[PDB]
Amino acid sequence: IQKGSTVRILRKESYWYNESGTVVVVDQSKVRYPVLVRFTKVNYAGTNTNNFGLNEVEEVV
Amino acid sequence: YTHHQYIAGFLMVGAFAHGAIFFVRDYDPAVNTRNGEKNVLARMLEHKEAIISHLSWVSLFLGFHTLGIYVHND
Amino acid sequence: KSTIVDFNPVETSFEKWAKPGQFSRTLAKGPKTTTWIWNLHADAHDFDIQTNSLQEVSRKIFSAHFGQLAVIFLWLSGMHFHGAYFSNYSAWLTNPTSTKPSAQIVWPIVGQEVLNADVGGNFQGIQITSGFFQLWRAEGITSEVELYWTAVGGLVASFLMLFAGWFHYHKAAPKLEWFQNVESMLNHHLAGLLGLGSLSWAGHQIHIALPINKLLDLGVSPEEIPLPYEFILNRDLIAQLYPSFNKGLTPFFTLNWGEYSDFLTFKGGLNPVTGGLWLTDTAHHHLAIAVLFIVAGHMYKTNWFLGHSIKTILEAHKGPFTGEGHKGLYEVLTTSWHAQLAINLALFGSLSIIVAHHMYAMPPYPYIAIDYPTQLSLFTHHVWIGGFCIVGGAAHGAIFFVRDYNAANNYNNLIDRVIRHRDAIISHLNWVCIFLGCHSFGLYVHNDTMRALGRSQDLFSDNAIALKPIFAQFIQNLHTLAPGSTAPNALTTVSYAFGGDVISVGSKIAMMPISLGTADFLVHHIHAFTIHVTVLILLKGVLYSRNSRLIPDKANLGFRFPCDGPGRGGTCQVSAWDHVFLGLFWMYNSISIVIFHFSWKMQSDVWGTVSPTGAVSHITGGNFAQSSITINGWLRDFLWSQAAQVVQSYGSSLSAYGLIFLGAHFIWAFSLMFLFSGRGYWQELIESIVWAHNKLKVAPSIQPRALSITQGRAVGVAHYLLGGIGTTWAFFLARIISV
Amino acid sequence: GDFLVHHAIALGLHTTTLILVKGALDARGSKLMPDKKDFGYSFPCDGPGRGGTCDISAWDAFYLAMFWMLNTIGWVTFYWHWKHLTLWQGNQVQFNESSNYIMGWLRDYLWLNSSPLINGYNPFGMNSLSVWAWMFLFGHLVWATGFM
Amino acid sequence: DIGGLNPCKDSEVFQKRLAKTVKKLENRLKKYEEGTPPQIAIQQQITQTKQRFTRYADSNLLCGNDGLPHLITDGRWSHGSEFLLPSILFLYISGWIGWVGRKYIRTVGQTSNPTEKEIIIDVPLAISIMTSGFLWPFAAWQEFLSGDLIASDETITTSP
Amino acid sequence: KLKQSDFPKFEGSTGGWLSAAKNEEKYVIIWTSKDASLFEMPTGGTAKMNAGNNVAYFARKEQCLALGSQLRGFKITNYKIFRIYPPLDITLLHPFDGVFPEKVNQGRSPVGKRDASIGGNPNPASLKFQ
Amino acid sequence: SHTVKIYDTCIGCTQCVRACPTDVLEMVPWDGCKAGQIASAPRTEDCVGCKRCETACPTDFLSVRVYLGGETTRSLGLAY
Numbered sequence A: 001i002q003k004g005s006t007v008r009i010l011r012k013e014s015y016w017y018n019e020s021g022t023v024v025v026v027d028q029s030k031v032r033y034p035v036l037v038r039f040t041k042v043n044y045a046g047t048n049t050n051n052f053g054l055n056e057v058e059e060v061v
Numbered sequence B: 001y002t003h004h005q006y007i008a009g010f011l012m013v014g015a016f017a018h019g020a021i022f023f024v025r026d027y028d029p030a031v032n033t034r035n036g037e038k039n040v041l042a043r044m045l046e047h048k049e050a051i052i053s054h055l056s057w058v059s060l061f062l063g064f065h066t067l068g069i070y071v072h073n074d
Numbered sequence C: 001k002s003t004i005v006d007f008n009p010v011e012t013s014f015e016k017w018a019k020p021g022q023f024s025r026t027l028a029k030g031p032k033t034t035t036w037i038w039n040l041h042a043d044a045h046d047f048d049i050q051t052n053s054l055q056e057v058s059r060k061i062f063s064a065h066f067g068q069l070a071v072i073f074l075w076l077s078g079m080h081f082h083g084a085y086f087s088n089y090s091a092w093l094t095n096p097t098s099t100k101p102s103a104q105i106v107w108p109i110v111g112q113e114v115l116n117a118d119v120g121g122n123f124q125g126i127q128i129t130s131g132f133f134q135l136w137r138a139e140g141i142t143s144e145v146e147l148y149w150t151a152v153g154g155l156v157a158s159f160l161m162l163f164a165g166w167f168h169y170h171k172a173a174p175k176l177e178w179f180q181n182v183e184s185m186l187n188h189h190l191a192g193l194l195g196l197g198s199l200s201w202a203g204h205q206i207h208i209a210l211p212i213n214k215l216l217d218l219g220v221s222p223e224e225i226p227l228p229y230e231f232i233l234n235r236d237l238i239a240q241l242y243p244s245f246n247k248g249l250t251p252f253f254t255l256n257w258g259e260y261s262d263f264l265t266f267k268g269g270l271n272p273v274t275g276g277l278w279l280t281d282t283a284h285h286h287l288a289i290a291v292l293f294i295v296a297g298h299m300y301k302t303n304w305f306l307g308h309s310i311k312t313i314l315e316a317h318k319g320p321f322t323g324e325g326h327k328g329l330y331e332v333l334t335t336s337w338h339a340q341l342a343i344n345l346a347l348f349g350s351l352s353i354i355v356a357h358h359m360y361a362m363p364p365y366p367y368i369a370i371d372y373p374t375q376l377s378l379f380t381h382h383v384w385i386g387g388f389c390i391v392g393g394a395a396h397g398a399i400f401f402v403r404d405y406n407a408a409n410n411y412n413n414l415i416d417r418v419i420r421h422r423d424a425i426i427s428h429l430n431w432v433c434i435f436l437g438c439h440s441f442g443l444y445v446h447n448d449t450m451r452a453l454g455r456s457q458d459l460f461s462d463n464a465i466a467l468k469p470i471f472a473q474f475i476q477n478l479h480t481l482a483p484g485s486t487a488p489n490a491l492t493t494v495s496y497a498f499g500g501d502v503i504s505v506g507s508k509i510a511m512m513p514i515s516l517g518t519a520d521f522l523v524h525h526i527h528a529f530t531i532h533v534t535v536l537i538l539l540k541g542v543l544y545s546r547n548s549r550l551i552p553d554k555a556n557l558g559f560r561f562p563c564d565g566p567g568r569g570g571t572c573q574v575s576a577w578d579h580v581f582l583g584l585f586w587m588y589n590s591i592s593i594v595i596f597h598f599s600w601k602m603q604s605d606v607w608g609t610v611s612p613t614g615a616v617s618h619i620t621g622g623n624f625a626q627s628s629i630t631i632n633g634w635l636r637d638f639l640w641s642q643a644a645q646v647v648q649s650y651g652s653s654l655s656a657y658g659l660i661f662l663g664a665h666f667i668w669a670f671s672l673m674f675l676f677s678g679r680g681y682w683q684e685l686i687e688s689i690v691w692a693h694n695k696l697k698v699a700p701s702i703q704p705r706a707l708s709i710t711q712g713r714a715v716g717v718a719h720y721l722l723g724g725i726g727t728t729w730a731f732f733l734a735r736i737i738s739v
Numbered sequence D: 001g002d003f004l005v006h007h008a009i010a011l012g013l014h015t016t017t018l019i020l021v022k023g024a025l026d027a028r029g030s031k032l033m034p035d036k037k038d039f040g041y042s043f044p045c046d047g048p049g050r051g052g053t054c055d056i057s058a059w060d061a062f063y064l065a066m067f068w069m070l071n072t073i074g075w076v077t078f079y080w081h082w083k084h085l086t087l088w089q090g091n092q093v094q095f096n097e098s099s100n101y102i103m104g105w106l107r108d109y110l111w112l113n114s115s116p117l118i119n120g121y122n123p124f125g126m127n128s129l130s131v132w133a134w135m136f137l138f139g140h141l142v143w144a145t146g147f148m
Numbered sequence E: 001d002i003g004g005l006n007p008c009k010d011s012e013v014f015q016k017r018l019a020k021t022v023k024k025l026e027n028r029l030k031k032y033e034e035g036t037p038p039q040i041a042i043q044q045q046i047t048q049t050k051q052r053f054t055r056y057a058d059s060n061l062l063c064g065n066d067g068l069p070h071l072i073t074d075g076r077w078s079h080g081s082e083f084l085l086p087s088i089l090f091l092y093i094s095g096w097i098g099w100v101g102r103k104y105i106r107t108v109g110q111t112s113n114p115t116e117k118e119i120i121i122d123v124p125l126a127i128s129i130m131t132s133g134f135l136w137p138f139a140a141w142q143e144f145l146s147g148d149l150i151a152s153d154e155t156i157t158t159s160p
Numbered sequence F: 001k002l003k004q005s006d007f008p009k010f011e012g013s014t015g016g017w018l019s020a021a022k023n024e025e026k027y028v029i030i031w032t033s034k035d036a037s038l039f040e041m042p043t044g045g046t047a048k049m050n051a052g053n054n055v056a057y058f059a060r061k062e063q064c065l066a067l068g069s070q071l072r073g074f075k076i077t078n079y080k081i082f083r084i085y086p087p088l089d090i091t092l093l094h095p096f097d098g099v100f101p102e103k104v105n106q107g108r109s110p111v112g113k114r115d116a117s118i119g120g121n122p123n124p125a126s127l128k129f130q
Numbered sequence G: 001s002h003t004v005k006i007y008d009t010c011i012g013c014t015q016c017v018r019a020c021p022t023d024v025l026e027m028v029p030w031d032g033c034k035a036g037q038i039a040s041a042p043r044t045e046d047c048v049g050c051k052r053c054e055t056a057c058p059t060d061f062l063s064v065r066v067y068l069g070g071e072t073t074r075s076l077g078l079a080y
């Protein structure tokens, strides 16, 4: 995955679970949740972006 | 008749409340799942949205039309 | 480049009409959830958060006032047009005591033409309880052409006010200094508006209403009554009815004002022909009011070395118990629109309630006292408006405290000292509310349980333990003795409610001494208790709007917020808005009890018919004295008994009242869904509904969200008020029109 | 009238079932609270955040469904009692005609048959039904205190 | 006949209802004068009442013991104009409404600002979609066949 | 006029502490101000600062912290909040390590940190009878 | 006293700490995020349960979680 890639959220406790988002940036450092994904639908708190782990996102073909 | 019907409603609400309590504090997904596949009870939480949506549809259908006919007669 | 206005401040364009939410910084970005739609209407008139300049807020308020006055003028024009075209006003003029006023006919669709009642005068339509016919008769309007011309003038005036609002927002908007001339504004509103309006109305009454109504009462038919302009061009048509116009204005300018006693009287009582106040008394009243208000308008210093400065008056009113006194109040009331709105709305609602009382107490229109539906509707409507306006004044006082209150500018003044001992005020008001409720209501419950136990001598009744309102009876005695003793130039008491003779017009009672017994004691203390509890809720909201022991920084959360969280044991409804919500509920309770007391007492002990020999028979038969002292009595002899006409209205011309009765019950019960439930359940149900929509690929882009907590409360209270007030509306109207 | 009231009963049953089933299935979590099981069956809320979470627990679903159960049982018992009052009095034509519209219920069941009850004690006397009128008023008072 | 009911053309209580309503209307008519608009309105009411009763009598309508038309909605085509034909009409109209709404939602859902086009409707596109709903039964059973009517697993689900 | 010279020029309000902050605990906030600014008390109304040492007593930690948050608007930062038990048992509370909690300071260990997201919490049925 | 837990989804944006009305949360060094900081809850005895901390949390389903528990005069917000 990279910037601009489309991924499916696999985190169950997510307002965008099973949904598709756009990767903003994948951090190359040793952070726990490097993948930053932007969504079109705001969550219940109003935010439309979140940091996800490498195993919590699945790239769409 | 009134006493027994009120007791009936109370008992039904209690049954559903204790089902909810079982879900909260006694339900174990691991026991009700074998190799990814889910048993008859665990599958009720998979189409839970379907169940709730169709209960909502039936309730709205009946309410809309019963009230409509009653108000039309009124 | 005028010193009072700014020229062409805002361009007249439709571009912002196509951008909803442009006023708000947060809503301008566009909707993402359905909460945006509701926030759009909740912030439309909150001009404080739309601009950071007091000048812009003031200009918006000024133009909004113009729009509101245009709407009011359009409403009045519609009323006059309906009177001119869809009314039986001409027939009602010739038979005021036997024709019911109707000014709205119903189209014949879906069988609704049954609503066109037999109002009399060869007319079919809805009976009118707004009293416009009596008002028009008091104005001297004897033809429907005059109603049409008044409607045309109302339309022209409404367009003029619309143009004025547009002009003063887009072409010449006044500056802040112009708005802050409170001395000049008070001078003008007191002299010009109030005094000159009273003077102009006195002139109209004297020259048009006095002769035309005197001819009408003499039996002259409206067709042979001269046109109103002929009473001005001919000093002989009015000098025959009032033989004092023959002297002209010479007695006025020679200080010989005694000559004008023909048409400027001081009589009191009611006109025996029409049952209303003497229009000569009304004209004299308006003249005196005009002079008093014009004099009162020359008080505040505006542009000369003459008059008062409100700042100097307030700052001089200090005291040992009040510290700095009223210092800083002038700055508060000249820099905060919310404080002015609070004061004006509170006094305006109180004035509306006072108007409601004085209306039925002293009927000011011809043939309005014998139109019981009109009297009941006018009283109930004005009391409801007064209660709503009072709650609004409390709400805007709380809003001022949250938003526009500056602690530095109010050091040790009255506002500061009130906040410093808010605990004492609220605790003592709590004790008073408990005392009053315990006593009034528990005396009611004691009466109920003594009656249920077969102990009739243990009640708080007249034939039992008696609580005579001696103080009110003393006042009643003082007023009935006033003519000739304390008001030596009066011929009759101000109102026959205080005592005197039974005034009947066409065998129908207009006014009669309202006896006060133990039943009135209990209901009056119920009124006091309900008013005190409403004041408690609203004052607790205003005083604890900024901080408390629970939330020391409640002002940082704003005026309108649902809570601070489930902590501290639970911090629901701590806002100040949530206090205007509960206070709205309690105002509904208080006003409902007030109007119930009025309806039952009038029907049982004032209204009715008078036999030719002088025997008085009332609508219900005096059951108020003995059966209004128990809650079962109120349930049975008032609610159950007088609800008979509403439930038996089906198939008749009052069936619309039964339908509205049922619909208002439905709406009131609907409110309880929002009042009793919470947002989380509805959001989680919307989750499954959204799942179904997504399964069918029909999920809207604007994400559907359950109504916010504050909006849920607002919807609940609005539906509750609408349902309750509509139920009482249908009940009252059907009952008082049937009988 | 039986048809319409049976459909009203079905609506009441379905709505009570909807509330209870929604609370039971959503007890372990939802989108607004995907960890609701960690807070137990009965908790006040999750706070004003995320738009507001009033009555989000499963206990609150029971609490809301109690009103609907009371309403449904009220409809059932109203129907039964009015049908049997008309059957016993003999005026079964009163039910068959007036039971098709709401005002028929309000006027001919409640308003009509409440006359003996409210006259259990009047400013003139009392009957053995006086205790029932007192209980009537007591129930109204407790109902409105619940409203408080 | 069906359910113990009888045709309203032979129901005495039906004619009694008609006669009582007409008598009440005529008694109301008596208290007005000449050819004045109130009398014209009451006469129109009488004429409409008579026409409605006559049409209900000659309508294959079954009346009970109260003299009111009862609806036979068990499904038989004999009384098919009471429920079945209005049922088909409503199903057509409501399917039209739902189809045009869904088509508009899916059409503006693929534009740059889907949420803007929901508070500010694209009236040209809205008119284009709305008049295309007359084929909603055919369009629905041409999109369901292609799998374009139902989502499969991109739909979101809660934690349990 | 007042018991101590460092008290803010407050006229006293019936919203201060009660018998609880005489036998359970009371909270004192101290700060130094350059100007005798007029500020709003967390309990009642308007008080006047001292051009120097200022000391205020409250019944809750939240009241002292609300006052401190208000002080930040006056460019006052050196405010410090203490807890006093029934006797003179003073404990510094708010600037616990001299650095405000919003700024990271070395020497702080994570308390209440779980090395997983919310979804990793154990099922309640496995946490029965412990 | 209530229980406050911090989860490694913390991005160290400090909005929770500066929203706590009773000084319960603080920022401590960390190496699991870009900011190099994580929220901590070392003074939960002062936690009141107002949940302002998690109203300011930007992470998807929160990184600070407040579990209401036993009540205390501090946690009940009792000035008396």
Ligand code: CLA
Binding pocket: B010, B011, B012, B013, B014, B015, B017, B021, D041, D042, D059, D062
């Ligand atoms: C045989 C049936 C049965 C049994 C064994 C239980 C057992 C239990 N239930 Mg349960 N329940 C039942 C029926 C039953 N319930 C029914 C029928 C309902 C629907 C109304 C419920 C609704 C329900 C809920 C919503 C909850 C429970 C809970 C519980 C558990 C704790 C109970 C508790 O703390 O009591 C506490 C007892 C009281 C608070 C006393 C209440 C008394 C009420 C108010 C009536 C008293 C007023 C009285 C009529 C006065 C008359 C007034 C006068 C003027 C006329 C326990 C395992 C709780 C739990 O945590 O489960 C794990 C819980 O949250 N139940």
Ligand code: CLA
Binding pocket: C061, C062, C065, C066, C069, C178, C179, C181, C182, C184, C185, C188, C189, C191, C192, C193
């Ligand atoms: C004698 C002069 C005079 C008169 C009659 C009025 C009358 C009024 N003013 Mg006003 N005002 C005046 C002087 C005057 N003002 C001065 C000198 C100032 C500057 C301090 C203001 C500042 C001011 C503000 C800021 C506001 C008012 C408002 C109002 C209205 C109150 C609403 C009401 O009671 O409805 C009664 C309504 C009527 C009786 C309808 C007929 C009234 C018409 C419009 C005559 C208005 C007189 C007007 C000043 C003449 C100017 C004409 C123009 C070509 C120059 C009322 C129309 C309020 C309002 O509603 O705004 C529109 C409001 O917000 N006034």
Ligand code: CLA
Binding pocket: C041, C042, C043, C044, C045, C046, C047, C345, C388, C389, C390, C391, C392, C393, C395, C399, C559, C560, C577, C580, C581, C584, C718, C722
């Ligand atoms: C002179 C009268 C007056 C004026 C100028 C204002 C002005 C204001 N009020 Mg206010 N208020 C008033 C009277 C007034 N109020 C009264 C009498 C009450 C007591 C009920 C209140 C209670 C109140 C509260 C509680 C709040 C305000 C707020 C506000 C501000 C924003 C208003 C807004 O955007 O609403 C836009 C308009 C609407 C949203 C309209 C809503 C529709 C209403 C609720 C229903 C009306 C139904 C109608 C009768 C028809 C029903 C018939 C049915 C059959 C259909 C604004 C400064 C709010 C604020 O933030 O202030 C800063 C706020 O929170 N006011």
Ligand code: CLA
Binding pocket: C429, C430, C431, C433, C434, C435, C436, C437, C438, C441, C442, C445, C533, C536, C537, C582, C583, C585, C586, D141, D144, D145, D147, D148
């Ligand atoms: C019928 C229902 C009902 C009743 C009885 C009350 C009663 C009361 N409300 Mg109210 N309230 C109601 C509905 C009701 N409310 C609703 C629906 C709402 C929602 C908006 C509110 C919202 C509300 C607010 C927001 C406030 C109140 C307040 C008050 C209190 C005013 C002080 C008073 O009179 O106390 C005296 C008590 C009574 C009159 C009740 C009856 C007591 C009897 C007659 C005498 C004593 C009986 C005796 C002790 C019995 C002993 C025997 C027993 C042990 C067996 C009082 C307790 C205010 C408050 O806190 O008090 C100051 C207040 O601020 N209420």
Ligand code: CLA
Binding pocket: B053, B054, B056, B057, B060, C688, C689, C690, C692, C693, C696, C698, E097, E098, E099, E100, E101, E102, E104, E121, E126, E129, E130
């Ligand atoms: C117009 C598009 C549209 C479509 C195709 C559907 C389709 C559906 N809805 Mg639905 N809904 C819509 C709009 C729509 N809805 C709107 C606008 C609302 C807000 C009031 C809802 C609220 C709603 C609820 C609360 C529920 C459904 C449910 C359902 C499902 C069962 C059918 C039902 O109960 O109808 C429900 C229909 C209504 C309650 C009335 C809808 C209001 C109008 C008629 C629709 C709006 C028309 C729109 C403005 C047209 C604009 C298009 C144009 C610009 C081209 C089905 C998937 C139920 C479900 O999940 O069952 C599986 C359910 O419980 N819907």
Ligand SMILES: CC1=C(/C=C/C(C)=C/C=C/C(C)=C/C=C/C=C(C)/C=C/C=C(C)/C=C/C2=C(C)CCCC2(C)C)C(C)(C)CCC1
Binding pocket: B015, B016, B018, B019, B020, B022, B023, D024
């Ligand atoms: C018609 C007929 C018949 C048949 C009958 C039948 C077949 C019936 C059935 C019936 C039925 C079939 C019923 C049922 C019901 C059910 C119910 C009522 C249920 C409920 C449920 C619940 C309450 C749940 C709970 C829970 C939950 C929530 C979850 C968890 C678990 C539990 C389980 C706890 C016969 C042949 C005999 C004869 C006559 C005719």
Ligand SMILES: CC1=C(/C=C/C(C)=C/C=C/C(C)=C/C=C/C=C(C)/C=C/C=C(C)/C=C/C2=C(C)CCCC2(C)C)C(C)(C)CCC1
Binding pocket: C076, C077, C150, C151, C152, C153, C154, C157, C196, C199, C200
């Ligand atoms: C009903 C109505 C209307 C109408 C109104 C009107 C018509 C009014 C009028 C008004 C008027 C018509 C007024 C007038 C006024 C006047 C005046 C106010 C005057 C005054 C004067 C004076 C004050 C003088 C004094 C003097 C001098 C200065 C010198 C010499 C001496 C003397 C003392 C004489 C409209 C349509 C709008 C709307 C609806 C309602």
Ligand SMILES: CC1=C(C/C=C(\C)CCC[C@H](C)CCC[C@H](C)CCCC(C)C)C(=O)c2ccccc2C1=O
Binding pocket: C673, C674, C675, C677, C678, C679, C682, C705, C706, C707, C708, C709, C711, C712, C713
């Ligand atoms: C039902 C309900 C909702 C859901 C209600 C919603 C989503 C409102 C939906 C309104 C629709 C979409 C528009 C209005 C449709 C009406 C037919 C229009 C009004 C009727 C006119 C005559 C005015 C809440 O969000 C809520 C929040 C807090 C406490 C209680 C409740 C609550 O009870």
Ligand code: SF4
Binding pocket: C562, C563, C564, C565, C566, C570, C571, C572, C573, C678, C709, D044, D045, D046, D047, D048, D052, D053, D054, D055
């Ligand atoms: S949600 Fe309802 S309950 Fe939970 S905090 Fe906000 S208000 Fe109090």
Ligand code: SF4
Binding pocket: C567, G004, G019, G020, G021, G022, G023, G024, G025, G046, G047, G048, G049, G050, G051, G052, G053, G054, G066
């Ligand atoms: S509740 Fe949330 S906000 Fe209030 S203190 Fe405990 S953590 Fe800080």
